[PDB]
Amino acid sequence: IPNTSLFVPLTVKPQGPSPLDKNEVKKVLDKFYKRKEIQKLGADYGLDARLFHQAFISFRNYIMQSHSLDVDIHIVLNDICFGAAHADDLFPFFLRHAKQIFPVLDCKDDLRKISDLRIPPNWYPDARAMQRKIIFHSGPTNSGKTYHAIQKYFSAKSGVYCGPLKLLAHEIFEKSNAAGVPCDLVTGEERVTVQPNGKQASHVSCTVEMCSVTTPYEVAVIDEIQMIRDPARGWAWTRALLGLCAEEVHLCGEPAAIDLVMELMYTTGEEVEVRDYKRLTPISVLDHALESLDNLRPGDCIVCFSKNDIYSVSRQIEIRGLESAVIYGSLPPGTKLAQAKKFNDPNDPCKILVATDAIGMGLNLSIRRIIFYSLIKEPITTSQALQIAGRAGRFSSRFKEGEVTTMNHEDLSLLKEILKRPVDPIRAAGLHPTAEQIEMFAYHLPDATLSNLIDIFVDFSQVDGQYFVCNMDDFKFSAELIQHIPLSLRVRYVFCTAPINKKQPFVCSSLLQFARQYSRNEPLTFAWLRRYIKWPLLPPKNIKDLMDLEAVHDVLDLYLWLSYRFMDMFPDASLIRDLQKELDGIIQDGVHNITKLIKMSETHKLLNLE
């Protein structure tokens, strides 16, 4: 039943210069309002209580303040006043007014058919037209579960690697070419062709959002397939799984994902083969907390769940004469890699890593012991903890094997309770609105804002039981940010799907500026952006300075991502990429010397930690 609270009223104003007794009409209208049958009638046409009331107020205001009323309606008013007409004889006119306020009502069925998201496999006739065999490589995080899949892909005549992260799409691109198997890179922000002339290699590595479902592939690898259930990003794994025209689809993920995949493949009638992988070296949950950093030991990783903690723990490590590496998600790619390369290096005294849950996926890290600094983000799910715990790995001179512990004593028994709790299997895969679907809604409801259309679409949508419609909060956020800029729905739609980090004012300001300039057909040149970011940029002096530089970096990424969809309007990507590699460079330095930034933050900006 449509949630009528989503329908924003349209103003149907009264009309000016073009017998008629008002104290009478009032009495008629007010009875019109009260007849349990009129209400029950309205209800028939989908006007429940709230819509009835809102339509009625407008209608009654309409009738009462309009200089000239449409002729057919006067005639009907006179009869209920001074003839043998029943209230009911107004209802057809009421209904017309209502439908002008609430156009939804003229098209509930249309709206349902457009948002019918049932039997998603049918969205992919090319994949339906071929034999596809599924190979699920199930194992916990760090069980060499990917390894076999990758080789099969390297030796296939053609293949695609779908990754959960820019990082992993980069790693395989790098590992494939180094394996002498020419491989193109395809991500949102970056598209690299390796071939001399400029033709497509027969191997491609990409972030999952970007893979083609109309190219043939001998082999495809979809990595981290349990992400199919991620509230925001899930739709992308479902697309890859259902739609890749590969002769063998190799998935790699956790056992919790096997059931859903089986239900899915059943509806496609494709064969599935599970292959089990056990953990490389086993998982010993400790007995002694870290208690105090006076036990920090080469190979330790202290995992934090807020940046304040990152700066706090790393500070302490420096005051205690010990050297450390830092890793959090929003560090540029190069810096992350460089920070790990130090923590990994055997000839490097740096042997403590202070990190966020950013490490649970994407980086080659040689960690001996994981130390959960705390256990709260709500406590951390089994999946979450297991993912992270599972990073403890080598150092293989009798320190093979991995260890896990909390920071404090209060926390340790809880970590134990968590890690041996059974994992709920995943129940459904995500879907999302397509641009074309929303474009159709927008034809039906031209006066609804984009953000409101997403809500209405979602309310009207229908999915089979093994699926669910993805979160759209991010998209709705951008839609709200840019409602006041004139753009066709197609263009607006694309701008709203650009991945930005809402929590950063500069990124938001830039989304605005880019969209404004676009709408004004005024290209965003290399020269323009350099003025706008206020370049050149100096080394950071303190944390605020790093955050600001990370922000600018995020703005360059937003530009590049855009340059693939709007090429004339974003014409100088190569140049912007160059300037960004230069910025990742600046950040790397300021990050090497992070302890001094925390100092100038904690002694002058006194950023206290705890």
Place this chain on the structure above:
RNA sequence: CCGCC
């Protein structure tokens, strides 16, 4: 707060 496209 984190994670991320």
